Ligand binder design. Structure first.
Ligand code: HEM
Ligand code: HEM
Lengths: 362, 361
């Protein structure tokens, strides 16, 4: 229930241990005034400092003037910080505004079309995003709600996604969570303690070509539906062949323990692990940080289920893009469909109490 | 960490309220009574496993490679998490299987209420399973696997996820707050109050339906909050709507949350004043609802509210009179009922040989 420090060279919520809940919101900007947008970013940073410490925004949730609406909507009163992190990102469409055209990073690449894509344009894209993660879903909603409230008239929520449970791990010393297909998900990721691998694969560097992005990262979000009726009638052997690890232990095929290293030549040539492994992609390595979702029924008598896939990387062109291209023949494709997509440049961290979100860009 | 599955009553009504909810309504697609009874027994066997934290059937792995696993496996490694599974039967079930003359009179159809805006697709249902647990993945796994076991005899009609408190960080003493920011649950029937449960919650033999003795009647309402409107109201407007202050949740004029309210100090259309048993001839409800937030709608608004659940001994003397009295509730400006269902919740599964619905079938 403790707090995660908000200030740093990097934004929290990436290398941070993965919290239980997610509320992800994408915003479009509705103001033409650069000064007004900068004032928004400063007000948002002040609110974030309160929220991530477990305090109410502004002058608080009650005890103010009777005739005024309260500064804070109040539904997190008496709750702990709950490891809340707030991570902001900037979408490519943002750079068509405020004269930012020449500051768009080369590494913030539009994704190509992939075979099987069925992207809903209403739940894709966005000028910016806020990723709220916490162990308490009410804490995460309270944070998104109050940020959107503060931004009234300057931003509007384009789409959002709640994740009821994590399907990722940055802490390999703790139990790996399972996704809704029943497999452990997160075994071979990047750990928050692997500072060298984060430098190599996650954090943007000044020499990469965009100095305002130094210390930041790039985010790919993909909303993926799971065909669970189809999956649930597949044999156990079929399911394990699809991934290349057994279902119970999560060990690489042939081996006894989850964390034993995969021997890829023993997996089917279209096994998901074989195709996604860095060794199959010229070393390309991602930080996966996704969550499971379910949004009711599908209207056809079935549960709706999916995975909200989030990947952080130093350069979209050398992280997600090569790996996802290599998944064109993935055996998993029979059981999933990508139905939403968005990319964002995640700026560097808020260095101290005088700093603010996006200050290196604006 | 676990709640016993067997008893005179079904768990999940008077037992401690867990952090998360997955509520599912099912429709029945078989006409064959024997097929439906077979499913009730199979579901009961699965519920026994699930509430003890075990996988269904012969498990999630280790079986024949050429067969699908009995359990879909996403709760492997998790704890029981105080999972309870509570089954209920909808009025529409009684048009099947020759049961028409066995519908309880206390299982009444609800009247239309001023301001109803019910989505038919998220209303009704032949039966329900309320899955409550501290870990939402444990709850989802239970619904997912019951639906799979039932495939061919039942389909899922609608499903709702909900959250209350997070107990690993919030004292069990503390009243949870709803998404309007007010403490919610202060004056409620507690599961410790065995006499009030007998008077207001559990169906009795003399009530007129012997197979329902020890059961209860459930009203479910999906209530949307108009969040962005509410958040633009003044603090005084918000407190006037309920009759309690927002910080402490004390009734107007008193100092502490648990002070008994003085109804005449509240505005005449204040929510607490209209809902109170003294304004409804003594009618008293067990509320066991959960908050929800499903995302944002096409206009950018928060799709959020209260998945209201009330248990009572008779729908005609519980939910209906109180909801009728809310016709003029000041809160009506900020909420809209968009989904509705009622269920007869049978008595408990008495031992390892008993099964869900045995007193009815
Ligand atoms: C519903 C969609 C997906 C499911 C169910 C899924 C499932 C899994 C599972 C069970 C593992 C093995 C355990 C682990 O090391 O994490 C894994 C590994 C991995 N997956 Fe996926 N995955 C999905 C989508 C994706 C996508 C879209 C990508 C990238 C575009 C991806 C990239 C990876 C990578 C890089 C690994 C680690 C491979 C290694 O280094 O051993 N996954 N996935
Ligand atoms: C979004 C919808 C609703 C909200 C936000 C809400 C909120 C509240 C709040 C804040 C209280 C005061 C604290 C407490 O004793 O729990 C309360 C009391 C109560 N509410 Fe509501 N309520 C809602 C809908 C309903 C409905 C539909 C009913 C019944 C049909 C109902 C019946 C009651 C009752 C019986 C009390 C106890 C009053 C007393 O005896 O003092 N509520 N509610």
């Amino acid at each position: 229930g403790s707090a995660v420090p908000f200030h740093g060279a990097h934004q929290a919520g990436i290398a941070t241990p993965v919290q239980d809940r997610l509320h992800f919101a994408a915003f479009d900007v509705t103001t033409e005034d650069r000064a007004a947008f900068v004032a928004l970013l400063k007000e948002w940073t002040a609110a974030a400092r309160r929220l991530t410490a477990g305090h109410a925004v502004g002058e608080g949730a009650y005890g103010g003037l009777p005739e005024a609406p309260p500064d804070d909507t109040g539904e997190a009163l008496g709750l702990k910080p709950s490891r809340l992190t707030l991570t902001i990102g900037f979408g490519p469409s943002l750079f068509t505004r405020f004269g930012l055209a020449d500051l768009r990073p080369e590494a913030l690449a539009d994704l190509p079309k992939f075979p099987g894509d069925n992207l809903d344009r209403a739940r894709s894209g966005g000028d910016l995003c806020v990723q709220a993660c916490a162990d308490d879903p009410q804490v995460a909603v309270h944070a998104i709600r109050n940020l959107a409230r503060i931004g009234f008239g300057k931003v509007v929520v384009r789409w959002s996604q709640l994740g009821f449970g994590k399907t990722s791990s940055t802490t390999p010393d703790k139990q790996t969570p399972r996704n809704l297909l029943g497999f452990k998900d997160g075994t071979r990721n990047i750990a928050g303690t692997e500072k060298d691998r984060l430098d190599r694969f996650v954090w943007a560097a000044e020499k990469d070509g965009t100095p305002w992005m130094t210390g930041g990262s790039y985010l790919v979000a993909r909303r993926i539906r799971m065909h669970i009726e189809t999956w649930d009638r597949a044999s156990l052997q079929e399911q394990e062949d699809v991934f290349g690890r057994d279902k119970g232990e999560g060990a690489p095929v042939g081996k006894a323990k989850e964390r034993d290293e995969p021997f890829l030549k023993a997996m089917k040539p279209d096994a998901h692990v074989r195709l996604a492994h860095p060794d199959s992609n010229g070393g390309a390595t991602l930080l996966r940080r996704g969550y499971s979702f379910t949004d009711g029924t599908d209207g056809l008598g079935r549960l709706d289920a999916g995975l909200f896939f989030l990947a952080y990387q130093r350069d979209i062109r050398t992280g997600f893009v090569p790996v996802q291209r290599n998944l064109a023949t993935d055996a998993l494709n029979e059981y999933i469909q990508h139905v939403g997509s968005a990319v964002f440049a995640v700026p560097p961290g808020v260095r101290d109490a005088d700093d603010w979100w996006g200050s290196t860009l604006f």
